[PDB]
């Protein structure tokens, strides 16, 4: 029955990290009295922890923003290729945002070029699409949410070559349509472009805030 106790605390650790927060510590032993033939176990902890503060912000790598708008599908130093069997090109741009404190630069191509036809303001024959899938009940949490589906005058895209093989290095290009056409179709319910319909959503549940729900 010998009562053990703590000895002297050792040297404190220096702050491990060069940015932000870290943790320093001190180590003590139960070496001077020592519990012999039983007793207790020195009463407490052989380890203290402490937070150290370097007060300097940390590297954060930049992240890509979303891609911009596609450029028009025209040719440089020419005119336009609207409503014509001429494949062109168009470009798109990104922006690296958020890079601070010697962080890593954004990895990848900041530009994007793809091949295109042009149906910008092109009068195209059209046909009414079938009923779209029912949308979301809007407004969520607001008074009387309603869904919405719609039929729209879908243009008949012209039967062009979707794959255009260029020479030089024999590069074949997946060509996709660009532009807002002018779809021509017969009226359905007094409307030429889009006729929709709304229906109210049944048995709407109340929105309860998850931090207000846990508490």
């Amino acid at each position, epitope marked *: 029955g010998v009562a053990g106790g703590w000895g002297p605390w050792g*040297p404190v*650790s*220096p702050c491990p*990290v060069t940015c932000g*927060l870290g943790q320093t*510590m001190e180590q003590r*032993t139960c070496n001077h009295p020592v519990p012999q033939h039983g007793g207790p176990f020195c009463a407490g902890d*052989a380890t203290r*922890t402490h937070i150290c503060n370097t007060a300097v912000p940390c590297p954060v790598d930049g992240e890509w923003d979303s891609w911009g708008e596609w450029s028009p599908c025209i040719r440089r130093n020419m005119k336009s290729i609207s409503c014509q069997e001429i494949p062109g090109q168009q470009s798109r741009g990104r922006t690296c945002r958020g890079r601070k404190f010697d962080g890593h630069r954004c990895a990848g191509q900041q530009q994007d070029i793809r091949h295109c036809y042009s149906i910008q303001h092109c009068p195209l024959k059209g046909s009414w699409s079938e009923w779209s899938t029912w949308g979301l009940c809007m407004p969520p949490c607001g008074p009387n949410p309603t869904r919405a589906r719609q039929r729209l005058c879908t243009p008949l895209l012209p039967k062009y070559p979707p794959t255009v093989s260029m020479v030089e290095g024999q590069g074949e290009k997946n060509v996709t349509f660009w532009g807002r056409p002018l779809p021509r179709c017969e009226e359905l319910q007094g409307q030429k472009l889009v006729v929709e319909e709304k229906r109210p959503c049944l048995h709407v549940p109340a929105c309860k805030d998850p931090e207000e729900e846990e508490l």
Partner: nanobody
């Protein structure tokens, strides 16, 4: 930044015991979480044991749990690996490793500082 020196290896009979020690740089010792690795002939390097900066939290590989014990002496800038019931499959070059840990109770498996190694050979 930190240098690591292993010691205690040698030739042991099967079932015997061996105690390795790893000396690290004195001024930066309590900053780094530390551990033991080994690399057998013809095999990749594998995790053996880890210890936090505290010496209070340990982690072990399943192949050595119950046989090996990692300890830390924060008075004398050393860690130790007490290897009991040694088998011929434990023959490897044993490496001491050091790794930066933000918390003092965190055990790591990824380390960016490595010693030169100590040879442990177990004969049947």
């Amino acid at each position: 930044q930190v240098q690591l020196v292993e010691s205690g290896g040698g030739l042991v009979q099967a079932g015997g015991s061996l105690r390795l020690s790893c000396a690290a740089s004195e001024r930066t010792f309590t900053i780094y979480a530390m551990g033991w690795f080994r690399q057998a002939p013809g095999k990749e390097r594998e995790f053996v044991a880890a210890i936090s900066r505290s010496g209070e939290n340990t982690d072990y590989a399943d192949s050595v749990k119950g046989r090996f014990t990692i300890s830390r002496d924060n008075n004398k800038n050393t860690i130790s690996l007490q290897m009991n019931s040694l088998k011929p499959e434990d023959t490897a070059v044993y490496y001491c490793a050091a790794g930066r840990a933000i918390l003092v109770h965190t055990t790591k498996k990824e380390y960016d500082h490595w010693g030169q190694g100590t040879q442990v050979t177990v004969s049947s």
